[PDB]
Amino acid sequence: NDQTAVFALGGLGEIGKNTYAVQFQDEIVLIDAGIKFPEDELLGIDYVIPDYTYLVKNEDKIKGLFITHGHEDHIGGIPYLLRQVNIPVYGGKLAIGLLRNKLEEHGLLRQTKLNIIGEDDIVKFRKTAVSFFRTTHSIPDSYGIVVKTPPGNIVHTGDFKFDFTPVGEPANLTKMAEIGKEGVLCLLSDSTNSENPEFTMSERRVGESIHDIFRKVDGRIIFATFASNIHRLQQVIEAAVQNGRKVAVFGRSMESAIEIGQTLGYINCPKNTFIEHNEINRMPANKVTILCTGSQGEPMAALSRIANGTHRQISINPGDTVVFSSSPIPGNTISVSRTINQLYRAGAEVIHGPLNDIHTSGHGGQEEQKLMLRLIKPKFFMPIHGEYRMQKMHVKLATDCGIPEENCFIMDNGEVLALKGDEASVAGKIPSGSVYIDGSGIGDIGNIVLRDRRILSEEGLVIVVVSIDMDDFKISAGPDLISRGFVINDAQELISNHLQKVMERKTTQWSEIKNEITDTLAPFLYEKTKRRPMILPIIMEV
Amino acid sequence: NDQTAVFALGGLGEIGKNTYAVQFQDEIVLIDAGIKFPEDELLGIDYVIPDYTYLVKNEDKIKGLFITHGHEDHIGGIPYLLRQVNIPVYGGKLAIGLLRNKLEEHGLLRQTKLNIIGEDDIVKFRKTAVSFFRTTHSIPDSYGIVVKTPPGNIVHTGDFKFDFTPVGEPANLTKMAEIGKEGVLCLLSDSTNSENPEFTMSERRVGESIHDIFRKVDGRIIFATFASNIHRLQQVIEAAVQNGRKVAVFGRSMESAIEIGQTLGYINCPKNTFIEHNEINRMPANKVTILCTGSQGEPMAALSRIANGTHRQISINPGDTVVFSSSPIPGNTISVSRTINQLYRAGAEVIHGPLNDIHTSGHGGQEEQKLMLRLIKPKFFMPIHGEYRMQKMHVKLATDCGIPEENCFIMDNGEVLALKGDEASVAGKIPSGSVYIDGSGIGDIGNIVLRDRRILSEEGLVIVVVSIDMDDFKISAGPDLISRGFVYMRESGDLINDAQELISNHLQKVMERKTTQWSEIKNEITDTLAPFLYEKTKRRPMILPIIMEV
Amino acid sequence: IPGNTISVSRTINQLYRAGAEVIHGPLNDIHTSGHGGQEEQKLMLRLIKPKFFMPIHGEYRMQKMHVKLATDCGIPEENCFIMDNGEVLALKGDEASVAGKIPSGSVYIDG
Numbered sequence A: 001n002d003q004t005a006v007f008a009l010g011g012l013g014e015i016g017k018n019t020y021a022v023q024f025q026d027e028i029v030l031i032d033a034g035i036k037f038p039e040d041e042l043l044g045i046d047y048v049i050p051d052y053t054y055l056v057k058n059e060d061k062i063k064g065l066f067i068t069h070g071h072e073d074h075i076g077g078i079p080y081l082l083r084q085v086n087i088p089v090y091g092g093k094l095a096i097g098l099l100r101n102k103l104e105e106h107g108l109l110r111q112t113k114l115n116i117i118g119e120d121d122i123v124k125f126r127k128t129a130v131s132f133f134r135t136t137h138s139i140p141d142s143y144g145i146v147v148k149t150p151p152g153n154i155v156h157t158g159d160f161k162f163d164f165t166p167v168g169e170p171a172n173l174t175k176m177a178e179i180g181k182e183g184v185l186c187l188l189s190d191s192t193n194s195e196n197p198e199f200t201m202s203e204r205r206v207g208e209s210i211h212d213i214f215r216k217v218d219g220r221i222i223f224a225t226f227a228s229n230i231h232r233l234q235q236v237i238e239a240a241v242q243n244g245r246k247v248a249v250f251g252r253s254m255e256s257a258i259e260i261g262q263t264l265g266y267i268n269c270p271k272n273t274f275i276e277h278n279e280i281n282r283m284p285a286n287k288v289t290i291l292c293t294g295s296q297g298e299p300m301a302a303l304s305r306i307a308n309g310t311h312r313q314i315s316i317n318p319g320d321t322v323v324f325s326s327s328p329i330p331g332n333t334i335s336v337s338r339t340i341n342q343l344y345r346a347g348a349e350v351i352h353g354p355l356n357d358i359h360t361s362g363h364g365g366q367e368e369q370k371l372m373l374r375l376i377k378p379k380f381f382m383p384i385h386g387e388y389r390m391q392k393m394h395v396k397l398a399t400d401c402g403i404p405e406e407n408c409f410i411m412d413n414g415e416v417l418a419l420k421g422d423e424a425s426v427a428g429k430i431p432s433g434s435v436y437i438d439g440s441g442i443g444d445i446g447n448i449v450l451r452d453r454r455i456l457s458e459e460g461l462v463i464v465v466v467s468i469d470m471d472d473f474k475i476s477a478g479p480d481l482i483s484r485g486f487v488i489n490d491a492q493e494l495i496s497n498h499l500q501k502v503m504e505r506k507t508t509q510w511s512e513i514k515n516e517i518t519d520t521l522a523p524f525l526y527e528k529t530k531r532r533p534m535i536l537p538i539i540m541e542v
Numbered sequence B: 001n002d003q004t005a006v007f008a009l010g011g012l013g014e015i016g017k018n019t020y021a022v023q024f025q026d027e028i029v030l031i032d033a034g035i036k037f038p039e040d041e042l043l044g045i046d047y048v049i050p051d052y053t054y055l056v057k058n059e060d061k062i063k064g065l066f067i068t069h070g071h072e073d074h075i076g077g078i079p080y081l082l083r084q085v086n087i088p089v090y091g092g093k094l095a096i097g098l099l100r101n102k103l104e105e106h107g108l109l110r111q112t113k114l115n116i117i118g119e120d121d122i123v124k125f126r127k128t129a130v131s132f133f134r135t136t137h138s139i140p141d142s143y144g145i146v147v148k149t150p151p152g153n154i155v156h157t158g159d160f161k162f163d164f165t166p167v168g169e170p171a172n173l174t175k176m177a178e179i180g181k182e183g184v185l186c187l188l189s190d191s192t193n194s195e196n197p198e199f200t201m202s203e204r205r206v207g208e209s210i211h212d213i214f215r216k217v218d219g220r221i222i223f224a225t226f227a228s229n230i231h232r233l234q235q236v237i238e239a240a241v242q243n244g245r246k247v248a249v250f251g252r253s254m255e256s257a258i259e260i261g262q263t264l265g266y267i268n269c270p271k272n273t274f275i276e277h278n279e280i281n282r283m284p285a286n287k288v289t290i291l292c293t294g295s296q297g298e299p300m301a302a303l304s305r306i307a308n309g310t311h312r313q314i315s316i317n318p319g320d321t322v323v324f325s326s327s328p329i330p331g332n333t334i335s336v337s338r339t340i341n342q343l344y345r346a347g348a349e350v351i352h353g354p355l356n357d358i359h360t361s362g363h364g365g366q367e368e369q370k371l372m373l374r375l376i377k378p379k380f381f382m383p384i385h386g387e388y389r390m391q392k393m394h395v396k397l398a399t400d401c402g403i404p405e406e407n408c409f410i411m412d413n414g415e416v417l418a419l420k421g422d423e424a425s426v427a428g429k430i431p432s433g434s435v436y437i438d439g440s441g442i443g444d445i446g447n448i449v450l451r452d453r454r455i456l457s458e459e460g461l462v463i464v465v466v467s468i469d470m471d472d473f474k475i476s477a478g479p480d481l482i483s484r485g486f487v488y489m490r491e492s493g494d495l496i497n498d499a500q501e502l503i504s505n506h507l508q509k510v511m512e513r514k515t516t517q518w519s520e521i522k523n524e525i526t527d528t529l530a531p532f533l534y535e536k537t538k539r540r541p542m543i544l545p546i547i548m549e550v
Numbered sequence C: 001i002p003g004n005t006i007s008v009s010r011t012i013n014q015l016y017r018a019g020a021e022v023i024h025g026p027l028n029d030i031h032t033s034g035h036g037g038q039e040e041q042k043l044m045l046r047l048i049k050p051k052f053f054m055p056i057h058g059e060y061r062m063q064k065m066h067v068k069l070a071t072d073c074g075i076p077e078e079n080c081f082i083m084d085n086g087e088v089l090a091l092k093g094d095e096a097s098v099a100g101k102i103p104s105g106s107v108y109i110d111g
Ligand SMILES: [Ca+2]
Pocket: A044, A045, A046, A438, A439, B458, B459, B539
């Protein structure tokens, strides 16, 4: 009507896929278009992506895609979205930088309009304008966003914590306060860490903890962290340098992040601090610092190979100290444990866990979330970037801060928020969903495919194959059983004796034979094996 | 030897399968014979079990199987062991009780000798004797074990914590102290919680926390915990009763635990405290207490059905309070989160986490483990019941308590410890391993089979089948492609059609050579199909050719 | 030690003012009590089997709380005697009680 619409195509009720939109009449601003990693249950899948059908049926209106920060769950689905619409993209220097590299691997670099913005840029459209304010997060150069529309102003926090002693440029509190004063129709705030009451430890503190390790450790330092945390990488290098240590880098994403961190200016280091892979074994233990990936136990990554049997250039020598400057993402806890066990078994010493202060969340806890709420004055409030419980708890925070429960909307992907100064409500849905990605396939693999993968994976299969030349109705080869994932000579006989009685009979079509095979083999296997393999007959006419 | 041997057939380098043995000459005492639950990566599997080949090749010598406590990871593999050897079993009243029920489901109840022992029993053999001492753990009626042998005494802690204000019978500290004085050659101590420096909170404290919830909650209480924790179940019932609430039970294991807890005497409750499933919806919110399973998010369990769509008799009404009187076992964290999200979405209120004091470990932390070490005087020390790191840290605890690092043996399943007053060492291996169980099939499965399921589950498969020859070596049928899990047939019938042609044109050029043989054809099919699919699809299906000679 | 908190603060202020660096407090692990806490006290109680129990070496509240520890460990409240200086405990296998006083007090020493 005469209101503004706000909605998510992904990012609500989940961590990942974060793609949000604000739409006013014929103009529509997109915020983020990330990717999501498949939960274990989606057997073959590589990535998950939002259903863009609405954005497609409305491409003409899309005025731009803006990028809060450069994390995969914000930036990662952009190649896939750009295959289905061609729209202009705006972001900070680091996000655009990372997306550039990404669009090469996909080819779509040539034909997309990449825009780099900064604190002070405003991009105006007919009846809609977009401004920015700096925040703090687990990656450099992160912005929140203000979308001005007639009915009022919408604010997107991006992903944020508060850090009063940051490694990077301090979050713009002055500007956030202004934004609230100027008036704010609705706030989309990061809900991820809303269950934690504590105030997020400062990166300054982990830096201190890093330097402390570098002074105490007598041998090699193997330091595993997240490639995307440029500032943390900076602290590690400094520690290494300031302790007369050289740095070897392991992992395409690590090299890739350091390279882009170096250009662009987040990483500065002297001359011969960096070292080549062969050079390691030469120098003394206490001058080597290996900086790799695999802090989540992912078994293809650097650290896991180093521990788990062997990697090429690096082996664990007793006295080595490995540092997990991370925290296990849910479900990776077993992976990480395995790695740690191996490292210990291989004689290393491990520094992991919370009692050592070598990690912090990139997402603010309750006090930080409430600081946002009291810097902006949202008439209305929509929790984003979290599972249901994170959204719920976030809302308790907002009601506790005075905003009425009837002005708080905990939503799902696809629901739409009708926003106007004197009224707001969930006014209906939009086409939404999840779209799967295995190999070069993009939405190419349905559920009916995944049910097969599941069935296979629990039970196995047994293939019954026969050649029959059905003129004098005779079985001229077989039946042969070939099985996988199931464990059959007795069965090969059962299905033979019986298949012969079925040919003598002879009024035999094709589908009835497949059925006669299945319908008499299955129960015999179940009898013997209490299992239920996928049994599938193949007939050859010869 | 003139030494005693000590070893594990499972339970080291892992949590689960706990089966340990002490052997002196021709006599050999077993302690525990548990089962283990499959890590996600073992696709089809139901349970894992130790390789008993050594126990089999030596059945005559086995003098008995003794049972510390009655947890599945200690008692659960016994039906499977008893299929391959018939030996006498000894245990406390609760363990034997639970194993009895178990042996019915398996049939082997008729033909096995179940023995019930208590604190004060000694079972003697030619040159070997077995005694007991009470400990505290997350299940009632738990014992530690002392195996006396000529070369010296071996002590097995079972699973233990320390609780000075327990719900059950207090751990026998006096007797532990005596055992150490009397002399101890080697200690096998529970390593599971060795990474935690803190002192384990007492069950008394959770009971208090339970009663507190029962006073504050205005509506229904849905209380999810571990069926095997009879004493915790007792505290829940008391709270319910003492607050004029009735108790509805949900879960076969929950009913089963309460029943055996009731008989045997761990659970006592008045008249009409227990309620039938239909009776719930009748009475007022604040008089209903539902006591179920599914605190780990297991999707077939009671609580999960209640939240996740629907269960039969029970739905979530706003105002309901669900209590997770548990802590998420590693890897179940995602399951539990889902459940909690649903519960919240369904208008419930949830009490989960550590800041509310509604759970404790059944396994002692560092101070407790050190108390053991200073009650027993082990010449030598062998950490048991934990992953490698837990064993390692446990050893640091032992060295810190003065026992020399060269007397501490962190071992793997199968390694054997030669023990004698003046010398000890890992003196060689024994046949050991893991035996998977799917269906009614023990070791019906191999690691090759799991590789197949793994390959199958991610990639799919494509079967290429051909009939060949009149002895003329011509292709008389095919090649036909039939695929599953690889691509949506109902739509890729375009892709696999091109492939059906590729493999035909090429397979014809291969038949006009006779510089070829059976294995070379399968390879020629695979080696030329695979890359084409990868080209088109970037997936890598398991491609397997079947040839028929006609 | 209670009541010395102001003394210690003054010293620390001066030290800081004089350009020193001070390591004080509980977050650095540079001190422990010489006296066990509740779990330790309960370990005692379960190593000895006291028919009867008398809390010593503490202010009233410390005696009281100590007794809650003993009752929690199963020893009956009527077998626990929180006493004052001078009271006397009549102890015999089948009976015990505070059976009267003795001359007691504090003698000050000045000079
Ligand atoms: Ca794949």
